[PDB]
Write a protein that binds this ligand. Sequence first.
Ligand SMILES: Nc1ncnc2c1ncn2[C@@H]1O[C@H](COP(=O)(O)OP(=O)(O)OP(=O)(O)O)[C@@H](O)[C@H]1O
Ligand SMILES: Nc1ncnc2c1ncn2[C@@H]1O[C@H](COP(=O)(O)OP(=O)(O)OP(=O)(O)O)[C@@H](O)[C@H]1O
Ligand SMILES: [Mg+2]
Ligand SMILES: [Mg+2]
Ligand SMILES: [Mg+2]
Ligand SMILES: [Mg+2]
Ligand SMILES: [Mg+2]
Ligand SMILES: [Mg+2]
Ligand code: NA
Ligand code: NA
Ligand code: NA
Ligand code: NA
Ligand code: NA
Ligand code: NA
Lengths: 380, 380
Amino acid sequence: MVSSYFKGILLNLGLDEERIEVLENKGGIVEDEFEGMRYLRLKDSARSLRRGTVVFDEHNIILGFPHIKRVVQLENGIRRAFKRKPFYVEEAVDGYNVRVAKIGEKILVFTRGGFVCPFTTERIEDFITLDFFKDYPNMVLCGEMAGPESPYLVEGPPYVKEDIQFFLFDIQEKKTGRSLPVEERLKLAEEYGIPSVEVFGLYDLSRIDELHALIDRLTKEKREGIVMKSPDMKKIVKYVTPYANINDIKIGARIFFDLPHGYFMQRIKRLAFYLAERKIRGEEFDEYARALGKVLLEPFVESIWDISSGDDEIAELFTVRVKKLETAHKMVTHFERLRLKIHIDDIEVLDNGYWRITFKRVYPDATKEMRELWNGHAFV
Amino acid sequence: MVSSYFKGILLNLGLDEERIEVLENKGGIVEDEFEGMRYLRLKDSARSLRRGTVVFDEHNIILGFPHIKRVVQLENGIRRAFKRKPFYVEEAVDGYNVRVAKIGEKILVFTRGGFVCPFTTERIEDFITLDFFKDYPNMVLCGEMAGPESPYLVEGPPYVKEDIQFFLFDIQEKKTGRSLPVEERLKLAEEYGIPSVEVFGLYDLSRIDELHALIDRLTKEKREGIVMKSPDMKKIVKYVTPYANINDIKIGARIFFDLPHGYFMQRIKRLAFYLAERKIRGEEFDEYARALGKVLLEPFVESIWDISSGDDEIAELFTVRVKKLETAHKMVTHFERLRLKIHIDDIEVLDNGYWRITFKRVYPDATKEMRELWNGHAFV
Ligand SMILES: Nc1ncnc2c1ncn2[C@@H]1O[C@H](COP(=O)(O)OP(=O)(O)OP(=O)(O)O)[C@@H](O)[C@H]1O
Ligand SMILES: Nc1ncnc2c1ncn2[C@@H]1O[C@H](COP(=O)(O)OP(=O)(O)OP(=O)(O)O)[C@@H](O)[C@H]1O
Ligand SMILES: [Mg+2]
Ligand SMILES: [Mg+2]
Ligand SMILES: [Mg+2]
Ligand SMILES: [Mg+2]
Ligand SMILES: [Mg+2]
Ligand SMILES: [Mg+2]
Ligand code: NA
Ligand code: NA
Ligand code: NA
Ligand code: NA
Ligand code: NA
Ligand code: NA
């Protein structure tokens, strides 16, 4: 299942031979390839090697991006995580996570599971100077790809009016995964002109009222929320706006079936705790309740009416911009490998020479279940 | 774990010795006791022996009540289950399921998991003549206990103004579980004066418009829905009103945590399919969306505010009526055995000589999680 070349590497990293065999047989490690280069991807955790870690050789090991804990009560979340010490407050940008690293003579861009993304790898030169990797070849840039023309999301931050943008939020060492302190990271981003998530400033528990005001502005502006980081990057906590929880439900409700466990419940919970903590009552409360009822039912009922007539499946349309038509071919292949039913719906050339590709992604498992229910399937 | 007396019985029922040992070691069969009488309860299925089956000896075997399939699209559900043949339409009564059987010289009442219910066993003479069991000692009466003074539910049908009532919906053979045809069951209920679920009549697919009208009336009347049964009792399908789905959410949302998987999602799905099938749009649609948002958020936020100050836990209050004070003592013991934190809050004697017991049921697992979140616990 997995070559002894990679298993030798895992052994030298101190992993036990028996654990490697178990990971192999269960499919917790898998081999992959990009542009002819073989690498190992960790589908599950293995001692200190986090999920989404990729292994090309003994030196080029890109650690998986860690989970970020969230709180649902902002004031008491801050007191428990940070007490009264200062912490940085950054914008949470609603996109997809990327790790950017120099591998051999190539700059590769990895998404969360450890896949080389062919779109982001082609485009990354539009946002990040290669100079950074001439000077720091063993550092990994971590950030969010976000905007209205995204291959993986149908929403994005409102101030990105077209195409897509990179937003740096961490710099990590190859192999160890260690993060630079906030200040050194921000100094490097300025030195190299790497675009950064907005840094709102340095806060503490005593400034909770200003953070609530910040959350209300981010909400009105359709932005996702904040991420709170101790200066040494060891304590990290995220907190998202009611807009993000409501809009997430709206998007997911078109499909409803086959989503991650708890997708809707977790967001209803986050909304309830926001309303409780902010003591929201009366008409302002009713407006959230009406909005939640609408985003749960309207997209869902619309899809039901859609599938009740015809053979067409539930579908999302999205566009991306590419420099080379061959990149779009490579995204189709990559989408197939991820077991997604996506084809090219439309192509246009833009006045700046870029290709705008319109993709159509269909959802056959959600479609099947929704249709069987409409057609009267009885179930326990 | 389980006595060889009961294992001998399972062997004579054709079960394999190895399966018995597995069921024992996993806890799929467990011993229980009521008023000194030992019996075996099936916590999981075992070949033809359904979950909730109880075994006292070789003759007294009460088969677990089968799952009833539901549809979420009424018209196509009827076409798929019944085609154009006639079927009976009964009221779905919102209570708890009981099986009533003569065991030795005792009439015992079993709830769904196979527990002897001490409350319903004391009270069952108020609703069912013992004459039935003098004439049919090997038949089991199956029905719903429902009303405003229930030990297990906080809602009920509106026309039961006080106390609680039994509603027959099946008659089954001991040991085999076989159901009498609808007509013979209804003839027996009339012969013995056993109160019955309302039988709305005989319907077929061609009468779908009348069934929709029936559903709209049941909805306005705060009733649960219908159960559709072929005359030979072999095809059974339930369908519940939007009122039932909305009110269920309202009740569950006070607790939110520690509920069965999919409790809220399943009901949102049922609401969406009702609105789709009935083509509900405009203001009438907005009223359902507002109602769904309110029943999800208001009870939940209210409980959050409740637990954010004090040591009191989330709690429901309910009353029952008993003939003998000793019955209330026995319900306390029984609630403890079910791993529920319930104590007696108040007692009154009624002008008819019955005791009205007020119980308080607290929810410590839901309370703990809700409080840890309020206090800023961070989680992945
Ligand atoms: N300033 C930021 N700092 C760190 N991560 C950020 C920042 N802005 C956006 N992110 C993104 O947020 C992610 C973590 O929060 P998010 O709400 O997206 O959860 P997730 O990891 O995608 O999923 P889940 O909660 O299901 O595990 C990071 O992995 C990163 O992609
Ligand atoms: N007329 C009726 N015929 C049959 N069962 C009825 C009738 N009226 C009410 N019931 C009750 O409905 C139950 C089945 O439907 P219900 O919606 O209560 O699901 P459930 O068995 O409690 O749970 P789940 O769907 O989670 O398995 C029966 O077990 C019985 O208690
Ligand atoms: Mg995200
Ligand atoms: Mg979002
Ligand atoms: Mg269609
Ligand atoms: Mg029920
Ligand atoms: Mg109910
Ligand atoms: Mg309190
Ligand atoms: Na995460
Ligand atoms: Na888009
Ligand atoms: Na053009
Ligand atoms: Na059931
Ligand atoms: Na009650
Ligand atoms: Na009195």
